[PDB]
Ligand binder design. Structure first.
Ligand SMILES: Nc1ncnc2c1ncn2[C@@H]1O[C@H](COP(=O)(O)OP(=O)(O)O)[C@@H](O)[C@H]1O
Ligand SMILES: Nc1ncnc2c1ncn2[C@@H]1O[C@H](COP(=O)(O)OP(=O)(O)O)[C@@H](O)[C@H]1O
Ligand SMILES: Nc1ncnc2c1ncn2[C@@H]1O[C@H](COP(=O)(O)OP(=O)(O)O)[C@@H](O)[C@H]1O
Lengths: 370, 52, 370, 370
C-alpha cells in the first residue's frame, strides 16, 4: 500500500508538506499550536481548543502561541502530533495515515531520541506504511540540480553547513550552531525594548517576526552604519500604530554573523561555512568554494549575499573563486528536493517498512540514517 | 539597629535570611600492567655518578 | 574643584534622595505630582498649583495625584522637571544643581530616550557638573557589602533580576517584567471593587496602596487558602469607616507570582529569578542560587521569601542550598549603595563630565552605561 | 651561577613545574589562559582580567577559555609567555627567572620553530642562564630508574612512542600521532550533542573533560560492546543536574585505538607502539616487547591496558613475551625524571648557557638538543 508519498519538511519555523511529485509544496502553514486565552461566553463562537495554520493566523490576537519544536528538537510531542494530524486532516490533505509513504526531513546532528520518537509517532499513532528520515542538505542539492556543494541553510531554528561532494557527504565536516531566525526575532524584540516598544505576548511575537521579514536588512559593513545613526524608517503595525526603528533593522540580523551579541561564544554563520569547508579534504577546497548553496528562510535578508561573500572572501585564501548559488526557492528548496527524492524508485529501497520497525525498532532508523 | 529605626518602612519581626535544609583512578589497580614504584631517591642513587 | 555628590535615586513610586557619604536617605518622598481638583475661592488658600512632597500627602483629598514615571519609563518630562527641582528645592536639599554631581539610578533595559532626555535635563536645565547613571542591582550589592549575588528587586513598577558573580554583571541574563507594586495596587483596587467598595478616585489610590502595604500577606499554598473562607479582617480608613477585605488580601499579592491574573502572559517573580540564573553559565549556578539578594519595596510582604523559597525549590535542581538574603534595608538598599558608590574615589572617573557632554552628547552617556 | 634548577614540564593540557629535587611537582595547574566574558561593573571585583591558574579553575564559568598549545605545538606565544611568567609568579615559585637553569620538556618530532621560539623566549624575556630542552621518554626512563624500554605516552595533545635501548635513542623509530585526550574530549562532546546534552561553551568544555576523566571506560571487546545496548548510568553536573550518558561513555575513548571515528586516516595507539618497535632492528624487538613503560595522561582509562595487550598480541608475532609496566604517579612521571636528570652532575654539560645562545643562537639549540 502506497500512492504518492507524503513529503514533510518538519521545520521548526514553518512546516511545509505535500505529496511526492508535486513541483511546489501545497501547504505551508506555520509550526505552532494556538490555544485561546479568553473565555468563551457567547454560544456559536469559534469551535475547538486547538488552532493550527490558517485559522491560527487570522485569529492570532485571540491566541497564545506555543512553538512545539525549538532548535530542531521537539519539546511537546502532543503538539507535533496535533500538527501532523492537521496535515492529514480534511482541510489539508484528506488522506489517511496508512496509504502513503512519508518522507520527513530533519536537521543534522539531532539527538537520537528525536529520530526514535518521530518514528514512534509515525508508526504507532499513524500507521504509516513507509517512513524515511533524511538530511536537510541533500534535498537542497536535489532541488538545485547540483551534486557537489556546501549547503548552508538557516532555518528558523538551526543553521548548519554540510559539504557534499559528488553525492558523498563528509559527515565530520558538518558544523552546526543553534542560532537562527528565532534568535534574530527575539533579539529584535530586545532591540525594540531598548527603543521603547515592548512585546511580551506570544501572539505579538509574530508581529516581531513580521517586522523582521518586512524591514530588516544587513549592512555590508558593521561600522559604516553603526556610528552613522541613520534615519528612522517608520513601519505600520496591524492595528494602525506606528513604529520607527533606525538602529535595529540592521543591528538585529548581525546576530547571525556574530553571536557574541547574544552572549554566547560560538561561530558566526560565515565561520560555520568556512570551518565546514576547511575541515574537509585539501583537494576539495576550490570545488566547495565555488559551489555554495543557500537555503532556509533566514538567508533572505537584504544584503545577505553580499555580506556572506565578503566574509568568506576574508576567510578564504587569496584569489580563490567563491560562487554562492542562491536560488529563489530558499524556503521550499528542501521540500522540492523531498518531492524529487520521494518521486524516485530508489526511495522504495531507502525507506523502512512497518514490520522492519516492529522487528527491530530504533536500530533500523539509525541504520538507514544516511 | 543604630541608624535603621528612623526610616518609616524597615520591616521587622521576620528573619533576614531564608535558607533551606543544609545537608551533606581504577586503572592503577588493574591487572594488565605491572605497576612500578617510582622512588626518585633510588633512581638518583643509581644515576649518581654515571657521567656523560 | 568638586563637592559632595547628590544621590538622586529614582523610583517608579518613591524617589529617594540624600548626599553621598551618608547612611540614611534623609529626604524621601513619593514620586507623584498633585494639583488641585476643586476651585480656589477664599483668599489665603494654598498656593502653587503643583504640590510634590509631604505637602501632597497632607492634602491628598484636594489634589489629583498622577504618577509621571510608569514602569520605569518617564512618561511626563515636565512633571519630572518639577520633581527634580523639588529635590533641589528649599525643602529637601537647599542646594544648587550647579555645585554637585548627580548619581541617578535607572532600571535595566530601559529605552535609550530616557537616558538621553535625562542627560538633557540634568545638563541643560540643571547645570550639573557631572552625571553618572547607574544600575540598581549593583547598588544593592554595594549596600550589602557583597561581591556576588542575584539581585531580585521589585520596585513599584518594575521587577527584575540581574545575576552578578564576583562583581561581574551578565548583561544577557537580565530578566525584566513590568508587573510590580503599582500594578498589584491596581489589581487590589479591582478586587475591592469586586467586593463592594469603590476607589475610582486617583487620590484614593493612595488609600489602596496603604491597604496593600498594611494588610496583605502571601499565602504559601494559594488555592488551598482560597477555598478556606477566612475571618475577613477589618481595616480602618483615613476617613474613619471600616472595610472588610476578606479573601482579597492574599490573592491580590499573588499577581507577582502569577501574572495571569492581570490577563498578561509573562513570567512570575520566581520564574524571573530562576530564569535569570538558568540563562547564565553552568559553572556559575550554585553560587548564584546561594547568594540570592532581595531589594525593592514589593519584597516586604508577609511570607514573601518563604513562598519564594518554595517556588525556587520547585524550579531549582535537587539538593542545592538557597539563601534568600533579605536585609531590613530593602527599601533603601539602592540609595545606601549609591552613597557607597559615590563616596568612593574611582567615582571621580566613573561619571561623565559636563565638558564631555558638551563635546559628544548622548554618545558619552551611552558609552558609560555600566 | 648554578642554583637549584627549575624543571618546567610543559603539557598541552596540564602544565607541571617545580624545582629539581622535589619528589612530587608541587605546582601543577592546567594549561589555559582564561579571560572574562561578561562586563565588569562593581568596582573592587577581580583584577588582572587575565586569569591563569587556580583562579581560572575556581571561576571557570565567569571566563572564556582558550588553550595556547595544541598538539604539542605552541599556537599563541603571548599566552605562553604569560603562563611561564605565572610559573615564576608569586603563586607558584616566588623566584626570579635568572637565578635558575631551566629544564623544559617537549614532545618529539615537533616543529623546529617551537624549539627556536621557545628558547628565544627563555633567553630573551626571561634571562635564564641555561636552558636544556629535552624529550619526555628519556625523562620517564630516568624516573623509573631503567635504561631500556619503549616509552609510550598519551598526553593531552600528543600520543607518541619513543624506544630506547640502554640509553640509545632511535630517532627513526619514533611514531607520533596527534590524536589524544583533548581530541577524545572533543569527540565526547560530539557524542553528547548526539545525545541531547549539548555542551558548547568554552568554559563548559571543562565539564566534558571532567566527564571524560571520570565516567569513561574502554571495553575490551570493541564491536561486541560497540553494537549492543548500554545501561545509561547517571552523572551529576556541577549545576546539580543529572545526565544520562549511556553508550557514548565507551565509544568516546575508542578514538585512541581507531582514528577512523573522527575521520582521519592514522593509527591507533597500539599500532603506534607496534610500528615503533618494528621499525627498529631485529635483535631488539624481544627486549622492547618485554619492556613497555606507559606514561601520559590518557593512559588512565578503565580497561585500557587490557585492550592494549589484546591489540598488541594480535599484532606482535606469536610466542613473544609482552610486558607492560607503568609508574604509580603516571601523571608526574616525566617531571620526576626531569627532576632526577636536572639534579645530576652531567647537567652542567647537558644545558646550553646564555653565552652559547648569544654566540650561535638557534643553531646551538638544534645542536645540543640531540
Ligand atoms: N522574506 C524574508 N526575509 C527574511 N527572513 C525571512 C523571510 N521570510 C521568512 N523569514 C525567516 O525565516 C524563517 C523561515 O523558516 P525556515 O527558514 O523555513 O525554517 P525551517 O527551515 O526550519 O522551516 C521564518 O521563520 C522567518 O524567521
Ligand atoms: N511595607 C511594605 N509592604 C509591602 N509593600 C510595600 C511596602 N512598602 C512599599 N511597598 C511597595 O513598594 C513600592 C515602593 O517600592 P520602591 O522600592 O520605592 O520602588 P522604586 O524604588 O522602584 O520606586 C510601593 O509602591 C509599595 O507598593
Ligand atoms: N581518569 C582519567 N581518565 C582518562 N583520562 C584522564 C584521566 N585523568 C586525566 N586524564 C587525561 O590526562 C590528560 C593530561 O595529560 P598530561 O599529563 O597533561 O599530558 P602532557 O603533560 O603531555 O600534556 C588530560 O587531557 C586528561 O584528558
Amino acid at each position: 500500500i502506497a500512492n504518492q508519498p507524503v513529503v514533510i519538511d518538519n521545520g521548526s519555523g514553518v512546516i511545509k508538506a505535500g505529496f511526492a511529485g508535486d513541483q511546489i509544496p501545497k501547504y505551508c502553514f506555520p509550526n505552532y499550536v494556538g490555544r485561546p486565552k479568553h473565555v468563551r461566553v457567547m454560544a456559536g463562537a469559534l469551535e475547538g481548543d486547538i488552532f493550527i495554520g490558517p485559522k491560527a493566523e487570522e485569529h492570532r490576537g485571540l491566541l497564545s502561541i506555543r512553538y512545539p519544536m525549538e532548535h530542531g528538537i521537539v519539546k511537546d510531542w502532543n503538539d507535533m502530533e496535533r500538527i501532523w494530524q492537521y496535515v492529514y486532516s480534511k482541510d489539508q490533505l484528506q488522506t489517511f495515515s496508512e496509504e502513503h509513504p512519508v518522507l520527513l526531513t530533519e536537521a543534522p546532528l539531532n539527538p537520537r531520541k528525536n529520530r526514535e520518537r518521530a518514528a514512534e509517532v509515525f508508526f504507532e499513532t499513524f500507521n504509516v506504511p513507509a517512513l524515511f528520515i533524511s538530511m536537510q542538505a541533500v534535498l537542497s542539492l536535489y532541488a538545485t540540480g547540483r551534486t557537489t556543494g556546501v549547503v548552508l541553510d538557516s532555518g528558523d531554528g538551526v543553521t548548519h553547513a554540510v559539504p557534499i561532494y559528488e553525492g558523498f557527504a563528509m559527515p565530520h565536516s558538518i558544523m552546526r550552531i543553534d542560532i537562527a531566525g528565532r534568535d534574530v526575532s527575539r533579539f529584535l524584540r530586545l532591540y525594540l525594548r531598548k527603543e521603547g516598544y515592548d512585546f511580551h505576548s506570544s501572539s505579538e511575537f509574530e508581529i516581531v517576526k513580521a517586522i523582521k521579514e518586512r524591514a530588516c536588512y544587513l549592512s555590508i559593513n558593521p561600522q559604516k552604519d553603526e556610528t552613522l545613526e541613520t534615519e528612522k524608517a517608520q513601519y505600520y503595525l496591524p492595528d494602525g500604530s506606528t513604529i520607527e526603528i533606525g538602529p535595529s533593522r540592521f543591528r538585529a540580523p548581525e546576530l547571525l554573523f556574530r553571536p557574541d551579541l547574544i552572549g554566547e561564544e560560538s561561530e558566526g554563520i560565515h565561520e560555520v561555512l568556512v570551518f565546514a569547508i576547511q575541515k574537509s579534504d585539501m583537494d576539495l577546497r576550490r570545488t566547495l568554494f565555488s559551489n555554495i548553496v543557500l537555503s532556509g528562510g533566514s538567508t533572505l535578508f537584504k544584503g545577505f549575499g553580499d555580506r556572506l561573500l565578503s566574509e568568506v572572501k576574508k576567510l578564504a585564501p587569496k584569489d580563490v573563486k567563491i560562487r554562492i548559488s542562491a536560488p529563489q526557492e530558499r524556503l521550499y528548496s528542501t521540500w522540492i528536493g523531498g518531492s524529487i527524492l520521494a518521486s524516485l524508485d530508489t526511495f522504495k529501497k531507502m525507506w523502512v517498512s512497518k514490520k522492519e520497525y516492529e522487528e527491530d525498532g530504533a536500530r533500523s532508523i539509525h541504520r538507514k540514517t544516511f | 539597629d543604630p541608624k535603621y529605626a528612623d526610616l518609616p518602612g524597615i520591616a521587622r519581626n521576620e528573619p533576614d535570611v531564608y535558607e533551606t535544609s543544609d545537608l551533606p583512578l581504577e586503572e592503577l589497580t588493574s591487572t594488565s600492567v605491572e605497576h612500578i614504584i617510582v622512588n626518585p631517591n633510588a633512581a638518583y642513587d643509581k644515576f649518581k655518578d654515571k657521567r656523560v
